[PDB]
Amino acid sequence: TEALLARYRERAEAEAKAVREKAMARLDEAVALVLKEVLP
Amino acid sequence: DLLKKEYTGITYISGPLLFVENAKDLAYGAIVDIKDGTGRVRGGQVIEVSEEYAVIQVFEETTGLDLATTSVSLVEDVARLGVSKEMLGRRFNGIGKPIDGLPPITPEKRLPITGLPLNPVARRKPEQFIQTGISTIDVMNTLVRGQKLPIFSGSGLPANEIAAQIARQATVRPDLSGEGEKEEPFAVVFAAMGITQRELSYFIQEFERTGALSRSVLFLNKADDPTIERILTPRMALTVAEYLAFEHDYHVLVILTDMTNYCEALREIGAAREEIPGRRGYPGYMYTDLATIYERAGVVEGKKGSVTQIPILSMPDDDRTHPIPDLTGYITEGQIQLSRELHRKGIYPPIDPLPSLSRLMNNGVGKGKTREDHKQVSDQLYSAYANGVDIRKLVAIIGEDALTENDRRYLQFADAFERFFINQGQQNRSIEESLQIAWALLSMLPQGELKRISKDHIGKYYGQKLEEIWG
Amino acid sequence: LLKKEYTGITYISGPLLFVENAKDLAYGAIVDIKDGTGRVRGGQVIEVSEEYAVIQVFEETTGLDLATTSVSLVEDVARLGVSKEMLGRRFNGIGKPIDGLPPITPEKRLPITGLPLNPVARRKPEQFIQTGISTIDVMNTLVRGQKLPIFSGSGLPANEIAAQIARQATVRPDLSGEGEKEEPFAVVFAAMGITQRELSYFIQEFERTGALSRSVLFLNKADDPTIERILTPRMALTVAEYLAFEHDYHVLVILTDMTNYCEALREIGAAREEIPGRRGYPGYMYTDLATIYERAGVVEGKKGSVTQIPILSMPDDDRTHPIPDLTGYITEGQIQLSRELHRKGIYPPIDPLPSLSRLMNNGVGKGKTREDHKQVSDQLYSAYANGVDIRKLVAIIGEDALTENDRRYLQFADAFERFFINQGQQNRSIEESLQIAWALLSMLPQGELKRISKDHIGKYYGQKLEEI
Amino acid sequence: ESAGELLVATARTQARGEVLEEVRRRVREALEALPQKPEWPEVVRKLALEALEALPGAKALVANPEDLPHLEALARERGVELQAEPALRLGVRAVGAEGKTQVENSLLARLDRAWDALSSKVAQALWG
Amino acid sequence: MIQGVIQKIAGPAVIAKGMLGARMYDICKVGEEGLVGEIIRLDGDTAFVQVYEDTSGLKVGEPVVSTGLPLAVELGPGMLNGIYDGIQRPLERIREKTGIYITRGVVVHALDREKKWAWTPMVKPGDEVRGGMVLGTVPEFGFTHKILVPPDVRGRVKEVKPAGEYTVEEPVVVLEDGTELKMYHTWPVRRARPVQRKLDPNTPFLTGMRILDVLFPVAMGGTAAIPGPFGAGKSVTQQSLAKWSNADVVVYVGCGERGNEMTDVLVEFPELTDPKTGGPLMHRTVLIANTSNMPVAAREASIYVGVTIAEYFRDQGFSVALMADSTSRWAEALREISSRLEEMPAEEGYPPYLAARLAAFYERAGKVITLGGEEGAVTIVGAVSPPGGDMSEPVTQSTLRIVGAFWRLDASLAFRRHFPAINWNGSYSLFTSALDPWYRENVAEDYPELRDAISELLQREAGLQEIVQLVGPDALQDAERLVIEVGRIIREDFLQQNAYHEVDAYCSMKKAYGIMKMILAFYKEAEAAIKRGVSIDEILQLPVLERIGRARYVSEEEFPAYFEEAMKEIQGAFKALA
Amino acid sequence: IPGIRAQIRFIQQVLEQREREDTFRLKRIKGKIEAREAEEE
Numbered sequence A: 001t002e003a004l005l006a007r008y009r010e011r012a013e014a015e016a017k018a019v020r021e022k023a024m025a026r027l028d029e030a031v032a033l034v035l036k037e038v039l040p
Numbered sequence B: 001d002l003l004k005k006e007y008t009g010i011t012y013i014s015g016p017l018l019f020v021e022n023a024k025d026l027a028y029g030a031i032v033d034i035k036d037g038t039g040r041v042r043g044g045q046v047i048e049v050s051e052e053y054a055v056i057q058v059f060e061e062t063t064g065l066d067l068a069t070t071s072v073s074l075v076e077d078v079a080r081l082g083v084s085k086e087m088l089g090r091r092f093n094g095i096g097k098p099i100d101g102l103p104p105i106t107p108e109k110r111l112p113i114t115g116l117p118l119n120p121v122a123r124r125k126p127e128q129f130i131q132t133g134i135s136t137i138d139v140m141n142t143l144v145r146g147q148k149l150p151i152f153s154g155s156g157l158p159a160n161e162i163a164a165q166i167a168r169q170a171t172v173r174p175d176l177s178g179e180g181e182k183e184e185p186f187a188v189v190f191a192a193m194g195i196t197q198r199e200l201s202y203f204i205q206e207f208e209r210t211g212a213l214s215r216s217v218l219f220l221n222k223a224d225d226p227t228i229e230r231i232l233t234p235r236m237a238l239t240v241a242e243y244l245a246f247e248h249d250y251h252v253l254v255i256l257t258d259m260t261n262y263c264e265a266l267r268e269i270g271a272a273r274e275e276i277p278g279r280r281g282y283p284g285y286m287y288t289d290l291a292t293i294y295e296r297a298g299v300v301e302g303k304k305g306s307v308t309q310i311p312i313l314s315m316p317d318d319d320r321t322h323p324i325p326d327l328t329g330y331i332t333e334g335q336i337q338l339s340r341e342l343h344r345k346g347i348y349p350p351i352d353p354l355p356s357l358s359r360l361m362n363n364g365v366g367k368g369k370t371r372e373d374h375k376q377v378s379d380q381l382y383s384a385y386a387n388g389v390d391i392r393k394l395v396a397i398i399g400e401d402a403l404t405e406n407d408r409r410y411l412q413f414a415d416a417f418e419r420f421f422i423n424q425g426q427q428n429r430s431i432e433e434s435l436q437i438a439w440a441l442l443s444m445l446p447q448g449e450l451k452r453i454s455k456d457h458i459g460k461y462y463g464q465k466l467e468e469i470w471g
Numbered sequence C: 001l002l003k004k005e006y007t008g009i010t011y012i013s014g015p016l017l018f019v020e021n022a023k024d025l026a027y028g029a030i031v032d033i034k035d036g037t038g039r040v041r042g043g044q045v046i047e048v049s050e051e052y053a054v055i056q057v058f059e060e061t062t063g064l065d066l067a068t069t070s071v072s073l074v075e076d077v078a079r080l081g082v083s084k085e086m087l088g089r090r091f092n093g094i095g096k097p098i099d100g101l102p103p104i105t106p107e108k109r110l111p112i113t114g115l116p117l118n119p120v121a122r123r124k125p126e127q128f129i130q131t132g133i134s135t136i137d138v139m140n141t142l143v144r145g146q147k148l149p150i151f152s153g154s155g156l157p158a159n160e161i162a163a164q165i166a167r168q169a170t171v172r173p174d175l176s177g178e179g180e181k182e183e184p185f186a187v188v189f190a191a192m193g194i195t196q197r198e199l200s201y202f203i204q205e206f207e208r209t210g211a212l213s214r215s216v217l218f219l220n221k222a223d224d225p226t227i228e229r230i231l232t233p234r235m236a237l238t239v240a241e242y243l244a245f246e247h248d249y250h251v252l253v254i255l256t257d258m259t260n261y262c263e264a265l266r267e268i269g270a271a272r273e274e275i276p277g278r279r280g281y282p283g284y285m286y287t288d289l290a291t292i293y294e295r296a297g298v299v300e301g302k303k304g305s306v307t308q309i310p311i312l313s314m315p316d317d318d319r320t321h322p323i324p325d326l327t328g329y330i331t332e333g334q335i336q337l338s339r340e341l342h343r344k345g346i347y348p349p350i351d352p353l354p355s356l357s358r359l360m361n362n363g364v365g366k367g368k369t370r371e372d373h374k375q376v377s378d379q380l381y382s383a384y385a386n387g388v389d390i391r392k393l394v395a396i397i398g399e400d401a402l403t404e405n406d407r408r409y410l411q412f413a414d415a416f417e418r419f420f421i422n423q424g425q426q427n428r429s430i431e432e433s434l435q436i437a438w439a440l441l442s443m444l445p446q447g448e449l450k451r452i453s454k455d456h457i458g459k460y461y462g463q464k465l466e467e468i
Numbered sequence D: 001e002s003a004g005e006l007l008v009a010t011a012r013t014q015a016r017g018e019v020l021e022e023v024r025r026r027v028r029e030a031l032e033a034l035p036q037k038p039e040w041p042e043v044v045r046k047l048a049l050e051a052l053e054a055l056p057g058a059k060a061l062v063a064n065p066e067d068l069p070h071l072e073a074l075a076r077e078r079g080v081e082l083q084a085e086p087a088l089r090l091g092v093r094a095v096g097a098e099g100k101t102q103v104e105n106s107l108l109a110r111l112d113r114a115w116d117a118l119s120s121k122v123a124q125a126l127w128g
Numbered sequence E: 001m002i003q004g005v006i007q008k009i010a011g012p013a014v015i016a017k018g019m020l021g022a023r024m025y026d027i028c029k030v031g032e033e034g035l036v037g038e039i040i041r042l043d044g045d046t047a048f049v050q051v052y053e054d055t056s057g058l059k060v061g062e063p064v065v066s067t068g069l070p071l072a073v074e075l076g077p078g079m080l081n082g083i084y085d086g087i088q089r090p091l092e093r094i095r096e097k098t099g100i101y102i103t104r105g106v107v108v109h110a111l112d113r114e115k116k117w118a119w120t121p122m123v124k125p126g127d128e129v130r131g132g133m134v135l136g137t138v139p140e141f142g143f144t145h146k147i148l149v150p151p152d153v154r155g156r157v158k159e160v161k162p163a164g165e166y167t168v169e170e171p172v173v174v175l176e177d178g179t180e181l182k183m184y185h186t187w188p189v190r191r192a193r194p195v196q197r198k199l200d201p202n203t204p205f206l207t208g209m210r211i212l213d214v215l216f217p218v219a220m221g222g223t224a225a226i227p228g229p230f231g232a233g234k235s236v237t238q239q240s241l242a243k244w245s246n247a248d249v250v251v252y253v254g255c256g257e258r259g260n261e262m263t264d265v266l267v268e269f270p271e272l273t274d275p276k277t278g279g280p281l282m283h284r285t286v287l288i289a290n291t292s293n294m295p296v297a298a299r300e301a302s303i304y305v306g307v308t309i310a311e312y313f314r315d316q317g318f319s320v321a322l323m324a325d326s327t328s329r330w331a332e333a334l335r336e337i338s339s340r341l342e343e344m345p346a347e348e349g350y351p352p353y354l355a356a357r358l359a360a361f362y363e364r365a366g367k368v369i370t371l372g373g374e375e376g377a378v379t380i381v382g383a384v385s386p387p388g389g390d391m392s393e394p395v396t397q398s399t400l401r402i403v404g405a406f407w408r409l410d411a412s413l414a415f416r417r418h419f420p421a422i423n424w425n426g427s428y429s430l431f432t433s434a435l436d437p438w439y440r441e442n443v444a445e446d447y448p449e450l451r452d453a454i455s456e457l458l459q460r461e462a463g464l465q466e467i468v469q470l471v472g473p474d475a476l477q478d479a480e481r482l483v484i485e486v487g488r489i490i491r492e493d494f495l496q497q498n499a500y501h502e503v504d505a506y507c508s509m510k511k512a513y514g515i516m517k518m519i520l521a522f523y524k525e526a527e528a529a530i531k532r533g534v535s536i537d538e539i540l541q542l543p544v545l546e547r548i549g550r551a552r553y554v555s556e557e558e559f560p561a562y563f564e565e566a567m568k569e570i571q572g573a574f575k576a577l578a
Numbered sequence F: 001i002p003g004i005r006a007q008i009r010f011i012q013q014v015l016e017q018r019e020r021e022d023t024f025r026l027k028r029i030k031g032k033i034e035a036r037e038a039e040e041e
C-alpha cells in the first residue's frame, strides 16, 4: 500500500531536517576551520 | 600541489595522441586537463616524458582542439581515485565521475588506480566454495571465493544472463563447511567497457529487480562513450573492490562485461604509438596489462574480505585461439566457455563443460566442504560425456545401426546430460540437487564402467533413476 | 605553345623520380621525360609538394640520370582525341594507330578518367541486346546499359565467346513493337595482356565478317608497358561514351582478361608502396574497377547506350578470389563458364544455374522480345535445376530406382545440355532460341510446367525436336 | 522493498552534498572579500613569491591592475617585468621565458584544487 | 578566418601550411575552386586535410580557407522526396545546374531557399523555450513537419511571426536575447543528437518479409546487420524494407554502391503507394547517394549525414528506418584515409578505431523519449559486404558485437534462386523474447508457440538431412520422411518470398500466422495418418498440398477466407483416408 | 577430399596475409629509424 511510502517519505524528510539542523549547529565553525587550514 | 601550471605549446594532435613540448615537469603517468579555446576541459594521461615533449593520451574526442588556444594543466602526478564506503549504491562513468546526479563523494583515501602487486607471502589460499546454482559450474567447474573465473562468450550468446544469474544466486554454504553460519551478501562491483544500451538496460533492470543496486558500485563506459576511457575503468573498479574487501571485510564480486572492448582500446593506443604488435595487431604488452587487472583478486592472510572476478569476453569468431581469450586463459584460473551448438538446441545456460575449467576447484570440494563424492562424480561425468561425444562422431560416419549396446547407452547419456544437467533455465539448484541429478544420470551406465568413482561411493549413491526426480 | 623544362632531378629509384622546383606541376599531370640520348618517355605526377614532385614513369628508368634528364608538362589532365572516323581502326591502348593507317583528326579532346554519371541523369536499362547465344539471350538476357561479366577459367574459350558475341551482337529493333528505324550499333573491343596469338585471332575474326567496319579495337599486348594496360579500358570507355552520348550509338564494349588488368594494377600499386589488400591487390582495387564499370548505362534524354561485357578468368576456378569477388560486387550479374560442359565438348559452356542477369526482368516481354520470355526462362531454370538435383540423386539409389518423373527430368537435362547450350557457331535468333526452348520443354508433361501461364503453354507447346 | 532504503540513502547523500556546497559557497564569498582586508598586500606578496619560485626563469609576472602597485618593488628586486591584466582578479600570474609556460595563483584555483583533499576534513568536522 | 596554402597533395589528402589556429574536424575549402574537406591532423603550422572531392588538377600554393565550423547538415523542411550526395548537396539541383555529369565544386544549399512554407505558430510571446520543443508546424508532403528548437538553445520568446507563407531563412521566432529561430538549423554530423531518455524496444519493426519478421525479428528501435556475398539479395532486401516497412520515414544511404540502384529507386518509388498514409512512396524517403565511382572519402560523410537526418526525424516524433547500403565501403574509405595518414594498421589494413566508429554509428539507434517529450525511434539495418563471403573479417565481426539481429545471407541459397536466401541456421535475433507480448496481443495468443514449433521442425529437418544424404532418402524411416517433406514445404512455401511478385512482395503478420498454422495442421494430421498406416506417397499426392503452395500468392484481403477454406479442407481430406 | 583441400587453401591464404602484414610493418619501422638517422641523426 501507499501508507508505507508515505511513512518513508515522512521519515526521510525528518532525517533531512535533522541533518540540516545539525549542520547549522557548526557550519560557521567548519568554514573558519577550513579557511585557517587552506592559509599557510 | 596548490598552484596551477599551464602548458601552452602543443605541437601535435593526431588520433588519440597529443604532444606538448616544454612540459619537462610532468611526471610519467600524470593526469592532465586539456583546455581548448571554448573552455571545455578534457582529460588525458602522460605516457611518455622527455626534455623535448610529452606524449599525452586523451580520454575524449579531439574535435575543436587547436594548436594556438589549447593548453595542458596538471591534476596529479599519479592517477588516484577518491574512495569511500559510501560509494555503494552509486553509479559512476568510465573515469569514475558520478552520472546519477548525486553530489561527488567525499573520499576517505585517495588510492592509485594502478595499485600494487599483492605479496605472495600475504596471499591466502582460496578455499571457500561458492554455490552459483548452476550445475555445470557447481559440480564440474566449481567456483571458490577468491578466484578469477571468466566467461568465454560469442557474438549472440547469453553470457550477460549467466552473469546476472550468478550474481543473483551466489552464496556460500556455511552449513556444509562447518564454519560460522552467517548470511552476509556479496558486494558487486560492475565495470562496463563499451556496453550497448540493450545490455546495460538488461543488467540495470535485473539488478533493480533483485534489490542489489544498494550494495553495488557501477562504472559504466557505454558504446557511444570515448574509447580511450576504457583503459581506466577496470582499474578504477578494482581499486574500489580491493578497498572494500581488504579494508572493510566485504566479499566483493566484480563483473567486467566486455574485455574484448578493453583490448581494442589498448590496440588503438598501441598502434598510435608504433608498438611492436603480437598476434593480430594487439600490443606485445597485452599479457602484462591483462595480468595487472586479473591478478587483483584473491584472499589475504589475516583478513575476512575477498575479491572474486567474473570477467566476460566475446571470442571474435568463436575462436579460442584468438589473442584475447588465449592470454586471458593463460592468466585466469579457468573459464566457463559457452557453446553456440547448445544455444541453437535451446539449452540454457549453454555451457560446454569440456572446454571449461576451474583450477581452484580441488580446494573447495570434498569431505567437510561440499560432499565426499563430489570430485569423483565430476571426473566420471567428464569421462562419460567425452565418450558420448566421440560416439556421436563415430555415428556421423558409420550410422546408428552398427552401434553396440554400450555405445548406445553412452549416446543416451550424452543426450540426457545435455537435456537435464546442462539445461536448467532460471533455477537455483543446490549442490545436493546437482549431485542427485548427476547420479541419476550416471545410473544410466553399468556399475563397472564407473572407474573413476570409488566403490563405497558407488554403493552409497548408485542406482536411483531419473524418474524419481521428474515424473 | 612555349614549353617549360625542369632539370632539378634529385632522386631516381624504381619507377619514381623526384623533381625539385616543380611547384607548377599539377597533381595528376602528364609529363615527358627526355634523357641525354634524346629519347622522350612519359610519366605522371603522383604526389606534389613544395620540396619536390614525385613522377611515376610509364616505362623502365634505364638510361636516366640526374645531370641531363629534363621533365616537361604535356597536359594537366590525360585527354584523348576522339572522332567518328575511329570506326574501322585499331589502336594500341594509348590511342596510337597500329593498323598502318594515318592517324585520325580529332573533333574533341576528352579527359579519359571521365566524370561520374549523376544518378538523377540515368534511366533504367529497359531494352535487350540479341547476343545470338541462346543461354544468354533467354536465361541471362543482356539489357542495353547493363554491365554483365563473363567468368571464365584457365582453359575455357573466353576469347571465342567474346569474338562470337561481337560478331553476332545486334539490337533487333523490329521486335520493339513500334517498328522503329534501324539504330546505329558499334563495338569497342578492349584487349589487355593479349598475346600475339590471340591478337592475330581477334584481327582475323573481325576482318572475316566485316564487323571491324563498325568497331574500334584497342589492343594491348603482354610485352607492352604496364601502365598502357591501365589506360586501355579508360580509352575504350571514353570512345564509347563519346559515340553513345554525342552520336546516338549503341556501343557494346567487350573488355577481355580483366585479370591481367588487376595484375597490372597490383604491380603499379606495389611500386607505389601502398598497403596491400586480400592477396597483395591494392586496397583501392574495388574503387578502381568501379571507375571503369560504372561508365556503362543509359541517360535520360539520349538515344544511345553503353553496354559492357567484362571477361575474367578466375584463378584456381576460385569464385572467392578478389578479382571475381570485387567484380561481382560492382556488376549487374554474371555469366559463368563450367569445366564440366567443356569436358563434355559443349560450346559455349555456359552453366545456367550459377549465372544470373540482375536487369533481365525489365528487358523482356511485351514490346521487348515476346510475352513468353520470362516464364519460359524461369521454367527452364526450374527444370534444369531439378534435373541436376535428380542427377546427383542417382549417385545413391541408381537408375533402376528412379521414377517416371525422374526419368523425364534427367532426359530433359541431357537434351537441354545437348541442344540449348551446345550451339557451336550458330547465330540463333531470339525466336529460334525460344522455339528450341519450347521444344525441349515439351518433353515434360503439360501439367508439370507450373511456371508458364496456360495461355502460353497452349500457344507454343507440342512442337517436337524435328528441327536438327 | 528496497525502495525506502534507496530513497533514504539518496536523501542523506543529497543533504550532505547541500551542506558541503553551502560551506564551499561561503568560503568562496569570503575569499572574494579578502582584498578589502588590510592584510591583502601580504597575501599578494606571498602568492607572487610562490609563483616566481614555482616558475624558474620566469619572464614576466601578470597581476590585477589595482594589485601591481603592491608589487612594484617585488618585481624590480626579482628582475621580472609586470603587466596589467584586468581579467585576473585576487590572484597573480607568471609567464615563463619561453612564453609557452605560465603559472596561476588565483585564490579560486587554490580553492578548487585543494577542495577534494579538504573534503574529508570538512566532513569529519561537520559530522565527526 | 584562418587562411593557408597547399603544401603537399597525395591522393585525397592535402597538407596545408600556415593554418595555425585551425581546429580538428573543422571544414575547410581546398584549392581555388573551394573543394570541401575536413581537418584530421594538426602538426606545427600544418593541417592535414581530407577532401570530399576529386583532387586532380590541384597545384601547390593554392589557397586553403578554414570555415571554423565542423561538418554539419541543414535540418528543415525540404529533405523528403529528395536525393542528396555524401555532404548533403541536392543532386537534382546539381544536374539542372551542370548536366548529366558530376563536376566538383558545386555550391548548393541543401534546403531550397525560394520555396514558401505554410507556417502555423504554437508558441506565444513570453513562453520559455528549451532545446527540442516544437515552435510550430508546416505541411510537407502529408506529414505535419514540426519546427524544432536547436538542441543547445534555451531562452524566452519575444516575437512570433503570424500564420502565413515563409521561406526557410525567415526568422519565425526571436528570443528575448536576440537569437533568431528559423525553419531550419545546422548540426554536426559526428555528434549524436541529445534525447531525454532511452527505452526498451517492445514493438516490432515490420519488414514485410516472413523469414525476418518471424524467425529473426527486430524491434522498432533495434539494430540489424545483413552480411552476405555478392548476388545474395542485400540490396533487394533493403529495397523491400524501404517499400513495405512500417516506418514513418525511411532514410536510404547508398555508400559506395551502384548508381543504377538509386536510379531505380527514383524512377520507381514515385509511382508506389505509402503503406500507411497512402501517398507516393518517395514522400517518405530520403536518399543519400555516394556511388562507387564518386569520391571515396564522401562515403563517411554519407553515413553520418544519413544518421543525423534520421535522428532529426526521430526528434520530430516519427519512427525512422535507416538503411546503410554498404558499411564495408565506409570501412574501405577509412582504410584509404589511414593509408594517407601513415597510421599503423590493425587486421587487414583497417585502422584500429574501425570498431569504435561502427559502434558509435550503431548506438544512435534506439527508441527514445525526445527532448520535446514525444516518442521516437531509429532502426538501423546495416549491410556488410565481406570479401569472398568470409565472415571472420573485421567489419562483420565488429558489427556482430553491437547489433541485436544477424540476418546471414548465403551464397548457396542464392545460387539455387531461393530468396530471400537467409541462412536460418546461422542467423539470430535478440528481440524474440521482448516482442512476445506484442505478438500475443496483436496476432494471436499462440503465435510464439507455433513459431517455436516451426523452428523446431526446421532444426529436425536440418538434422535429418545429413543422414538422408549419407544413407539415401528412401532408406530412412517414415516419420522422418514426413519431417523432411514438411521442412521442404516450410522452405519453399513459407520461407521463400518473391520480392517482385505483386502480392508475394508483402506479407502481413496474420498471413504468416495463417500459413504457419496450415503447415502445422498438415503435419499433425500426416503424423496421425502414418501411425494409422497411411503410406508416404499417398500423403504427398494429396491435392491440399497444392493449396498450401499458393497461399502466399493470395491477396491480403482475400486471405482469411482462403485460410478458413484450407483449414477445413486439410481435415476433410485427411479424414476420409482412414 | 575437396573439402579438406578448400580448408587447406583457406588456412594457407590467411597465413600468407599475416606474413604480408608483418612485412609491411617491418618496412614501416625500418623506414622510421632510417628517416630518424637521416633527418635528426
Ligand SMILES: Nc1ncnc2c1ncn2[C@@H]1O[C@H](COP(=O)(O)OP(=O)(O)OP(=O)(O)O)[C@@H](O)[C@H]1O
Binding pocket: C328, C329, C330, C357, C358, C359, E228, E229, E230, E231, E232, E233, E234, E235, E236, E237, E385, E419, E420, E497, E498, E499, E500
Ligand atoms: N527476394 C528476392 N526475390 C527475387 N529475386 C531476388 C531476391 N533477392 C535477390 N534477388 C535476385 O538477386 C539479384 C541480386 O540481389 P541484390 O542486388 O540484392 O544483391 P546484393 O546481395 O545486394 O549484392 P551486391 O553486393 O552485389 O550488391 C537481384 O537482382 C534479384 O535478381
Ligand SMILES: [Mg+2]
Binding pocket: E234, E235, E236
Ligand atoms: Mg547490393
